[PDB]
Design a protein around this nucleic acid. Sequence first.
RNA 1: GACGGAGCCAGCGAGUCUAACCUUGGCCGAGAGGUCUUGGUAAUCUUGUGAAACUCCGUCGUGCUGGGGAUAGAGCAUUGUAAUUAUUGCUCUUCAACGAGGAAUUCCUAGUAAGCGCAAGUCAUCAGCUUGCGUUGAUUACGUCCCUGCCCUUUGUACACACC
RNA 2: UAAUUGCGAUAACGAACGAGACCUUAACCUACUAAAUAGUGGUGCUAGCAUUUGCUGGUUAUCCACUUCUUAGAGGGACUA
RNA 3: GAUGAUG
Lengths: 67, 205, 63, 141, 143, 65, 45, 100
Amino acid sequence: GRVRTKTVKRASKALIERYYPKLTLDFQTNKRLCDEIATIQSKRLRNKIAGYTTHLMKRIQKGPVRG
Amino acid sequence: TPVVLATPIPEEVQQAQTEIKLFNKWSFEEVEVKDASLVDYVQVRQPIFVAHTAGRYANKRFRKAQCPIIERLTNSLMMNGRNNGKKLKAVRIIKHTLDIINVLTDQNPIQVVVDAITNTGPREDTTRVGGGGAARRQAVDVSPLRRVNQAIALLTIGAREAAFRNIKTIAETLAEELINAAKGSSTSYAIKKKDELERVAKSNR
Amino acid sequence: TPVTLAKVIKVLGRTGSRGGVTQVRVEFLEDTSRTIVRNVKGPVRENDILVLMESEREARRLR
Amino acid sequence: AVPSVQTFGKKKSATAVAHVKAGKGLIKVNGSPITLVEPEILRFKVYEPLLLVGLDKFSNIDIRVRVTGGGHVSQVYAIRQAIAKGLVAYHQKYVDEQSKNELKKAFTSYDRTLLIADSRRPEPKKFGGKGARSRFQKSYR
Amino acid sequence: PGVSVRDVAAQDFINAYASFLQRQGKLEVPGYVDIVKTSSGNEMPPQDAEGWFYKRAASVARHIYMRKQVGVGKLNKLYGGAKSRGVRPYKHIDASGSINRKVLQALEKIGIVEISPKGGRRISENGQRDLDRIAAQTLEEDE
Amino acid sequence: GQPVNDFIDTATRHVLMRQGVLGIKVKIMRDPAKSRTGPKALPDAVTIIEPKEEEPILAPSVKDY
Amino acid sequence: RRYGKGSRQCRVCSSHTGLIRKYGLNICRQCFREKANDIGFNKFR
Amino acid sequence: IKIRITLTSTKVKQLENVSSNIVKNAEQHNLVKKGPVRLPTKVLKISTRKTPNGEGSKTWETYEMRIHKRYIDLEAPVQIVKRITQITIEPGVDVEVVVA
RNA sequence: GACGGAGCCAGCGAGUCUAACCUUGGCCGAGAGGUCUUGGUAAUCUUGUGAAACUCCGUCGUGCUGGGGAUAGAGCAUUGUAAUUAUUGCUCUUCAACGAGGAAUUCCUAGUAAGCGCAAGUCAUCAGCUUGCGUUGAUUACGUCCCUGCCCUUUGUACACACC
RNA sequence: UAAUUGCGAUAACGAACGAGACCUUAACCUACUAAAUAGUGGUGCUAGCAUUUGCUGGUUAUCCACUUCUUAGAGGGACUA
RNA sequence: GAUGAUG
């Protein structure tokens, strides 16, 4: 199953609340931003963090996301 | 017109640029069988050469239905331990068997294999049903894909058992089995077994 | 005896003590707009065609 | 120098290297004609990439293959991948894009493995059995 | 067009050369052709008792033509098989060393092979002429 | 997991008392922020940099040189 | 004496059975597990 | 003056400090050299039962010690060769130098 | 399918100090094996570990038969102070049960089951065993809680060594 | 959801171990750094068949080039985008 | 809504 853990849910949330103007819907762009805006220990976890941040960005375009 | 190269490609092997024939003898345009229920589960619309594809069909539920039928009959001859694997014998036994069908009937050999399938898939079967341990049988319908599956198993189990401890070769007993079943002859192992299953089903409705 | 054909239009669930008996609803090819529910023994999808040996036997459910 | 291209194909451990250059129509595998490939029954697997696109395309070229590793069956599948790959890489560099695209469309529509390798690989054994998943027999009395 | 040994199927060439040498009759045959069996793995001596030694010579001739060098050991490896061992399972077992040594010593006395630097035997200029000449004939007989 | 090898030391000893032997095992998880060679934090530790304030500008301007 | 089970003993515990000789270790399987980390054999896969 | 300097260690990190030192030192003396040739890693496996007494389910365990070997070729005057052999001694890395 | 002649292809490994390891090649011998040399302290040589199943062309022809090779006789060799209660290998001869297996019961969802053999561990010699490795490669679900059990909630209990 | 994995609900609020992350290995890279103790091509010498500039080998004492196949070090790639 | 004793 593709459920995402709390480490991913919260690291992604913590980036949107500080970097909305700089984040975009592109995965490749977001992926490179998270190298300069965070210190993460692995390519795998970084890809997942950037992926879910992108996912939330689409949501915000449709309207306010809870929390 | 024929072409010649620095490496010669025999003329027996050059007409195939216009149409693919199984074992370079049999065509596919003329194979169609009229069981309207089984069209979407017998693959005779993608012509192949050698019946040795090495595809992947066990990763999704219904991908095996797209495998060409000749190869699914090949697969079922690799049975009973000492013959597991050895797909090169299966390809040879089906090369001989398709040949014997044409001689014995002056008819397309693949079309005979298809007819054997469509006359063996039992239409009604029975299931164990009970409560607390006490049980009985009850009649049910049989699905299209399983009709093809149980067809092949019967045709090749009878052909294997008929050749064992016999003078006749495997390609021959299978050849006779496929010829009789497509004719609807009660001599075949496949047809007799089908009627045994459907008789029981009617008595347990 | 005659044999009638029908077309699966929905797969309702699974039954039998061990799950080997799916439950389907069908629409008859000739004289369509008559539908019956009955049990099947192998893997099955929508738009499949089933050969019914007797048409008028609606099938019970174990639950 | 004359136009040249180097390509390869694999199946299990088998690998074949096909050198392709502008020539007269030679097709030799392991220093022998393509007509003498063994096992016999599977000759049409090697012939397939030629027939499917006509012998015409191969008249102006020379193809030399060499195989190692694997076994009798897996090597044959390595040859057929190398031959198909060589033709597509040659048309990439020396004819044009359209020809490469249309070629690729024919090869793929028949059998994907002609160009893309099979991703399957063997599973390791695990102690306690004779295979990756099988186990020794268990008894209770 | 020219022809090389590699242009003709192995089965045709081996029988063709074996016949040629049988007619020609100057190949030395070691005398025990009726007693010896070709390996410890086998249980019956060759079925074609008349011509089995000539067949073996043809196979080795082509075998050298393909490759640099060989030795009596390399041929034992290549002509071994599965030993029955009865109740116990099979195991590769090497072939007869005497037979393979006296087909290589015989092939030298006919001039088809020579000793080579780096050990073992090797084709000779005269060897290549004979095998190549017989390949072109075998093709001619495709009618 | 792997961090065990990096950040956990371990030892065990035998003490021969008069009643009989009795053993000890000591485990020390060193603090990873003080690591000198190797990873400087556990794998699942994510750090987000706090950006600077950035005010809107009044009107477009240019600079010469 | 020049050979056999009596010619070889674990260099650490003098035990005669279970000795492993690969790469000239000559350490009994029990003691090897204890000393494996120091010798340089780690557990990966 | 042909020389072949080889290296064998169980841990790559230290061995790349030594190798990178050698090549970068040689290029500042403009010597002619081969590249650092990396030979296949050879791994050592020991398989053993975990249990020290024979009871229980048959559980087997495997260990691994890894060996990385490299070599470079130099054609350089002897005076520079002397200090080269002397520098880059590091724990856990083994070096051997052969002439001609 | 057994036997015979041909065809002809792997990957994981190991190898010489307080010393005899892995062995190409030449020659003798039916065979095992013997002898003289040679390379390798190893991506260098043994080693393309020319492995087995496998393909092709033949002999036999449903006969406990050329399926099967137990149990026995006799001779020649190798390791070892020493093999008798045959350590093991070779050669001829002897040529039994076994015709697909009762009640029961084990393993398994794809390069997986299963067929086939190789290196390593033990080792002077001895693998029908174990740890890995590759070559050939299907059938059948894509489910359920019926049998055997597991995890969570509610509920009854005269159980606490706890349904034995 | 494979998961006390998450969405949420909430007399609870904020935390720790376990699962996940992590490591090892198997798949891809005609892109970087190199390499005869790995390879391939060309060229000196050379055997055979045909001989129009052809087909297949030998020569590791010829030398030159190159890195597709083989090796590793450093990186890329998948996050169900 | 078949059978299932004891330590």
